[PDB]
Amino acid sequence: LHLHLRL
Amino acid sequence: LHLHLRL
Amino acid sequence: LHLHLRL
Amino acid sequence: LHLHLRL
Amino acid sequence: LHLHLRL
Amino acid sequence: LHLHLRL
Amino acid sequence: LHLHLRL
Amino acid sequence: LHLHLRL
Amino acid sequence: LHLHLRL
Amino acid sequence: LHLHLRL
Amino acid sequence: LHLHLRL
Amino acid sequence: LHLHLRL
Amino acid sequence: LHLHLRL
Amino acid sequence: LHLHLRL
Amino acid sequence: LHLHLRL
Amino acid sequence: LHLHLRL
Amino acid sequence: LHLHLRL
Amino acid sequence: LHLHLRL
Amino acid sequence: LHLHLRL
Amino acid sequence: LHLHLRL
Amino acid sequence: LHLHLRL
Amino acid sequence: LHLHLRL
Amino acid sequence: LHLHLRL
Amino acid sequence: LHLHLRL
Amino acid sequence: LHLHLRL
Amino acid sequence: LHLHLRL
Amino acid sequence: LHLHLRL
Amino acid sequence: LHLHLRL
Amino acid sequence: LHLHLRL
Amino acid sequence: LHLHLRL
Hints:
mainly beta, protein fibril, zinc binding, prion, 30-meric
């Protein structure tokens, strides 16, 4: 999986 | 899965 | 799944 | 599934 | 997995 | 999803 | 997902 | 994911 | 992921 | 990941 | 909000 | 928010 | 937020 | 935030 | 934040 | 395909 | 394919 | 493929 | 493939 | 492949 | 057979 | 067979 | 067989 | 067989 | 066989 | 016999 | 016999 | 016999 | 017999 | 017999 988070 | 989050 | 969230 | 949420 | 986080 | 194939 | 194949 | 193949 | 193959 | 192969 | 998803 | 996901 | 994910 | 992930 | 991941 | 021949 | 021949 | 021949 | 021949 | 021959 | 899947 | 999958 | 997978 | 995987 | 994997 | 098959 | 198969 | 197979 | 196989 | 195999 390509779990990407950007905050 | 490509779970992507952007906040 | 491509679960995408943008807040 | 392409579950997409945008708030 | 390519878990990427950017804050 | 429970995608099942049987050939 | 539980993607199962059987050939 | 539990991707299973059997040939 | 539990990617299993059996040939 | 528990990538298992058996040939 | 109590957004709850169960798949 | 209590965003809860269970797959 | 209590963002909880369980896959 | 209590971001919790369990895969 | 209590970011917790368990794979 | 299950091509079966018996002569 | 299960090609079977018996002569 | 399970090609089987018996003569 | 399980190619089997028996003559 | 399990190529087996028996003559 | 040309069994093709795309999800 | 040309069994192709793409997820 | 040309079994191809791409995730 | 040309079994190809790409994750 | 040309079994190729790429993760 | 000229048994010919082409798939 | 000229048994010919082409797949 | 000229048993010919081409896959 | 001229049993010929080409894969 | 001219049993020929080419893989």
